[PDB]
Amino acid sequence: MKRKGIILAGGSGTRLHPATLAISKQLLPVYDKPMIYYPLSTLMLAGIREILIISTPQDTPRFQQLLGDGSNWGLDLQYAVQPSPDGLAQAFLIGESFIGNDLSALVLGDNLYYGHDFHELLGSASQRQTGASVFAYHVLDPERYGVVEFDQGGKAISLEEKPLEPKSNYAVTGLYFYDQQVVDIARDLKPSPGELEITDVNRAYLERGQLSVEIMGRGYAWLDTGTHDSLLEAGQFIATLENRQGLKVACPEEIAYRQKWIDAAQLEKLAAPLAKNGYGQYLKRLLTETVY
Amino acid sequence: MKRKGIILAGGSGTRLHPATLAISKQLLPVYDKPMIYYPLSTLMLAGIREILIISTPQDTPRFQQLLGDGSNWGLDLQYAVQPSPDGLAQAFLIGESFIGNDLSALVLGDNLYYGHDFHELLGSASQRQTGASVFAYHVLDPERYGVVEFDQGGKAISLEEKPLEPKSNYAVTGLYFYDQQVVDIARDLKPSPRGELEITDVNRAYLERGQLSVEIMGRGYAWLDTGTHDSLLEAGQFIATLENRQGLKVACPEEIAYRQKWIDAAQLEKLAAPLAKNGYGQYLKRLLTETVY
Amino acid sequence: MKRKGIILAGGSGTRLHPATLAISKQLLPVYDKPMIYYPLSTLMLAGIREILIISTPQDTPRFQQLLGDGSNWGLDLQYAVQPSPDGLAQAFLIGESFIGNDLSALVLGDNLYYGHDFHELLGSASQRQTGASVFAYHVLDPERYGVVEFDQGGKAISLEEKPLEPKSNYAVTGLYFYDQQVVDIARDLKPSPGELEITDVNRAYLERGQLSVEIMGRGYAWLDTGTHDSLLEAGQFIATLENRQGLKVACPEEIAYRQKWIDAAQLEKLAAPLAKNGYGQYLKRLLTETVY
Amino acid sequence: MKRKGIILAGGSGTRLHPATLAISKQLLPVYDKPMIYYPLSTLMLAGIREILIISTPQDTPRFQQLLGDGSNWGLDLQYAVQPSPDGLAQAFLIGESFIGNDLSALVLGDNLYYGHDFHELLGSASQRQTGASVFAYHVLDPERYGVVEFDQGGKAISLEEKPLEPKSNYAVTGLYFYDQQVVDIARDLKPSPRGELEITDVNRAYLERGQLSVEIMGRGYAWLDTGTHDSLLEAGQFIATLENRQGLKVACPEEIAYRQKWIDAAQLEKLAAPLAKNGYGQYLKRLLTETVY
Ligand SMILES: CCCCS(=O)(=O)N(C)c1c(N)n(Cc2ccccc2)c(=O)[nH]c1=O
Ligand SMILES: CCCCS(=O)(=O)N(C)c1c(N)n(Cc2ccccc2)c(=O)[nH]c1=O
Ligand SMILES: CCCCS(=O)(=O)N(C)c1c(N)n(Cc2ccccc2)c(=O)[nH]c1=O
Ligand SMILES: CCCCS(=O)(=O)N(C)c1c(N)n(Cc2ccccc2)c(=O)[nH]c1=O
Ligand SMILES: [Cl-]
Ligand SMILES: [Cl-]
Ligand SMILES: [Cl-]
Ligand SMILES: [Cl-]
């Protein structure tokens, strides 16, 4: 069945001003590409093609100019705005008619993932046609996120949002898969102590016992881009991987062509406008080179 | 006699595409603040308050949104567009009416400077009220820049642009001081074989007239640019190591304007409030009570 | 059956002098621990307990003081020297009587690995009781390594050592698994144009059609520490992972305790001498915390 | 009148264990060269040629292997051990016969300095032939250091060691100049509550006598230390960005000795050969033909 994807690329507030005064976080580069390329590549990796990008009233035309209607990468892109940063769950209100009758999946515009068999870890998430699937990852600072609590035997029992006293060190990453049940669950939500919390959306699935909570192991890197210090670290992290390997991370053109969403000829047409820099040359090398 | 400044912050073309497809280079951060804060701070260190910012038609409003007219920082900022990226020396045809009969200074919107007595090094560039004054810095890769050539005694004898076999390793920094002759030198230049009004031709004109002062910017200075993705990241790591070590900032324009006495403590306090939550407003607040030597 | 491990921690020559004038590369720290901890942790991860450390005549007592007889981490450590840097295959001459009759495995002292299911990728290597198993990894600069060549259909056909003209971009990592056949193959080896080449040891297995060449995917990081620039990159790479996660990479004490090679009580005894710094505090946290 | 120098490069204890279980801190690299090259270079910048190096009994031979007696670099190096790590001011009881009736200078073997006119800033510290001279640098974390306190006019009025509530953000750098009184001040000190002969007591003695010169090391200077794993890595990224930008090196002792004229071109050429293969020997070779300002 049909599964659609949202990228919530909204306002980081004033938290990183003045770095973000001119233009929103998710259009900043992480090393060699816009930050958005990374969650865009995430959805593409779970095999999602029809995608809704949400952002500030101001930055939406810029995400638009950046991406187009997607048709160039064998994707289908539709855009929507969020008036005020009133919580991540608000993505499910804004995208209701986009979501329609289908299965959905929400990724944060400022979250990076990297690792082996990542395709498969998402592939097994996208496959469950019922309930919701989220990921837990061990971190040093669990307070900054939705913390998940497991019982003596591996089962999820509590989910607290930014708790002052973490129970475990297990944070909920910014990737989520939901069934047809999500939108309605989101309509019945009340503001928190003042946002529509993604964690309530998840605990509503936990109480109905339909939150599947799979561990994303220490062999995976989950980076968020929350501080100037960490945004820097993620640029160094990508830079080291890409220069070591001669291969890119979250290059969508490559992700499309590999999922066979565009033929060798279309990819080449995408290589043309960027032939002079290394980014194009990279796409061009993808026509002749075998990469396992 | 007063000096005006020009920041060139136009189109870097397609070189750093796709990072720069959505916004222009000079809005990307270097650590905790927009890249343009760094050359804007450089002009301020030179005591210059009237600055023209030249960018693309497409990005000009985003610069306006970030920097305004300068009144917040005791400056006056004007804006101009460069529709076609036809080379650096063109900032002088676009900036003509801005410049008038005044002295000027050009800065690249994508160069950072750091180090000791940087202020005094700019003051003596700014005090020479006739001719041009540029700066020479030893680099690894002078192939990429305007290269200077010195005789046995340290007089500059030639300037070449991007030679394959540079005569020295001394590159011309993206900082230039000019008298009133610069506009007329720029109006008379013919397009490079490329079709770019090259600033090295402008400086070369002044050199032929014995009016080019070339001062050495020591290896004790950091002159970084951000010409590649790797070097942008390198420049971010650099500032963060200085700021995290020191609890002082590099190229905080509120602090510098305060330190020039272009704004007072009351105005600084007002500038801090809408940012009191983050480290930056907290940093502007702390400047009010602390003596920093 | 019994499988033993070598760590070849010998001379990098004069390549990184003066940084390495005082003491050999593999005792330099990568971020928070000696470089050797990393290949040591690699062998431990393929379930290897009996290990031979080879190094310069000069640095052997220092590797010794660093590690002891291993008995503290439930390992069994024996030491051996290499007079001159006359090739990596020389490890199989020096360690003959150590190797004895058993299965073996050689890792380079200056190679870092990181990734998900790394235990398993080694577990499937250590398991094949016949022939040799090596890994290929895509890289930008294949010239610096043994390059492997694959045919139109995924099979390894040539192995060239530092070729001037790489065929593929696939380099041989510094992890190798060999059967009882290795030692003898190494005795019959002649010096190259002037070293005993590890690649000849491997091509000898390729000609007998007994080199198993498994792709280590782009989801894995293989770092070597060959330039001052790269040694730096690997320190930043570890630092980012460890500070993000609150978990260490290649902490042997943790690898032992998890493989149950030491009981909660012994680990605690190891936590004592380092209680004041973060490294001990980390071991101490391992007694009470559940890490999936 | 001549000045001797002392580098303290002893046991950092167990703090950076396990990185430092096999070798002492001051042998670890900062980028492309051993950490001790950096303070050794600092002494050389001060014009000091006779250096005592104080390390553990265990590591002393490895320093000897790396640095020798100095003759290669126009210096004379001697060695001494500190069996027990009893604090910095103890370098003066151990170094007594080395010091004699001469002036001295202490440097921490784990501090880096960079920036413009660093040489001249050391010269004026070295020219004051009476009293002590230290340096104050604004930091984020003065809790960790000896903190200076200034009155309204910039005279130093107190010194505190690791206060929980520092009076300023000005920390005392690990660089100190002393006259002949320092040994006698050190012999009379009583163990800190910890049991460490604290250098801040030594400097405090001189302050009480109106003989402490405290000079500001500007924010245009980088004074980095390597007190944590993260900051060691940060200091490596820092040097590499300067050296990779410039094609010049920071704290290359062959270059500095050559530049002081402590060795000549023939001697430099000899020092380059056993390293002609790597970038370092290539860098020593290139110093023979290039003019660097
Ligand atoms: C979007 C974050 C995860 C990217 S990743 O799967 O770990 N990764 C390194 C990666 C991978 N693995 N691949 C290979 C791949 C291509 C298509 C489907 C699955 C895997 C890419 O073409 N681009 C990539 O960035
Ligand atoms: C970005 C322009 C060069 C920066 S700098 O002169 O080296 N520097 C560290 C600096 C300094 N020195 N100062 C202090 C200062 C401010 C105004 C006039 C002289 C000195 C600042 O307020 N901000 C600064 O960024
Ligand atoms: C030795 C390089 C590979 C280390 S790793 O397997 O990727 N890794 C991150 C790691 C892992 N995965 N683990 C968990 C683990 C412990 C024991 C057996 C398998 C896996 C650790 O205890 N320490 C580690 O460093
Ligand atoms: C590590 C001591 C401080 C280094 S420094 O004075 O800022 N500096 C960059 C430096 C400089 N300036 N020089 C040039 C120089 C050498 C000798 C005397 C004056 C200047 C060097 O040869 N090596 C150096 O590391
Ligand atoms: Cl894992
Ligand atoms: Cl200088
Ligand atoms: Cl993979
Ligand atoms: Cl300064």
Coordinates of C-alpha atoms in Angstrom, one line a residue, chain A residues 2-10 26 35-56 60 63 67 75-82 87-111 113 122 126 133 173-179 182-184 186 198 201:
Chain A
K2 CA 0.8 3.7 -0.5
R3 CA 3.0 5.4 2.1
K4 CA 3.6 9.2 2.1
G5 CA 6.3 11.3 3.8
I6 CA 6.5 14.6 5.6
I7 CA 9.7 16.6 6.3
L8 CA 9.0 19.0 9.1
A9 CA 11.5 21.9 8.2
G10 CA 10.1 24.6 10.5
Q26 CA 17.4 23.5 7.0
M35 CA 20.7 20.2 5.3
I36 CA 17.3 19.2 3.9
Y37 CA 18.9 16.8 1.4
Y38 CA 19.5 14.6 4.4
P39 CA 16.0 13.9 5.7
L40 CA 14.9 14.0 2.0
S41 CA 17.4 11.2 1.5
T42 CA 16.1 9.4 4.5
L43 CA 12.5 9.2 3.2
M44 CA 13.8 8.3 -0.2
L45 CA 15.7 5.4 1.5
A46 CA 12.5 4.1 3.1
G47 CA 11.3 4.0 -0.6
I48 CA 9.0 7.1 -0.2
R49 CA 8.4 9.1 -3.3
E50 CA 5.4 11.4 -2.6
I51 CA 6.6 14.0 0.0
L52 CA 5.3 17.1 1.8
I53 CA 7.8 19.7 2.8
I54 CA 6.5 22.0 5.6
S55 CA 8.3 25.3 6.6
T56 CA 8.0 29.0 7.6
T60 CA 8.7 28.0 1.5
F63 CA 12.6 25.2 -0.5
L67 CA 13.7 21.2 -5.0
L75 CA 9.8 12.2 -6.7
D76 CA 6.5 14.0 -6.3
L77 CA 6.9 17.1 -4.1
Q78 CA 4.1 19.2 -2.6
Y79 CA 4.6 22.2 -0.2
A80 CA 2.8 23.5 2.9
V81 CA 3.5 26.2 5.5
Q82 CA 3.3 26.4 9.3
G87 CA 4.7 21.8 17.9
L88 CA 5.8 19.0 15.7
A89 CA 2.5 17.2 15.7
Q90 CA 1.0 20.1 13.9
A91 CA 2.5 18.5 10.8
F92 CA -0.3 16.1 10.9
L93 CA -2.9 18.8 10.9
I94 CA -1.3 20.8 8.0
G95 CA -0.8 17.7 6.0
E96 CA -4.2 16.0 6.5
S97 CA -5.5 16.3 2.9
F98 CA -2.0 15.4 1.6
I99 CA -1.9 12.4 4.0
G100 CA -5.4 11.5 2.9
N101 CA -6.2 7.9 3.3
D102 CA -2.7 6.6 3.2
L103 CA 0.2 5.4 5.4
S104 CA 2.6 8.3 6.4
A105 CA 6.0 9.0 7.9
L106 CA 7.4 12.2 9.5
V107 CA 11.1 13.1 9.6
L108 CA 12.7 16.3 11.1
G109 CA 14.4 18.6 8.6
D110 CA 17.5 18.9 10.8
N111 CA 18.3 15.3 11.6
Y113 CA 21.3 9.5 9.9
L122 CA 13.7 1.6 7.4
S126 CA 7.8 1.0 6.3
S133 CA 7.3 2.7 14.4
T173 CA 15.1 9.9 17.0
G174 CA 13.3 12.2 14.5
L175 CA 12.0 9.5 12.3
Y176 CA 8.5 8.2 12.6
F177 CA 6.2 5.9 10.8
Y178 CA 2.4 6.0 11.3
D179 CA -0.6 4.3 10.0
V182 CA -2.2 9.3 13.2
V183 CA -4.2 12.3 11.8
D184 CA -7.2 11.7 14.1
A186 CA -3.5 14.6 16.3
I198 CA 5.0 14.6 18.9
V201 CA 1.1 11.2 19.3

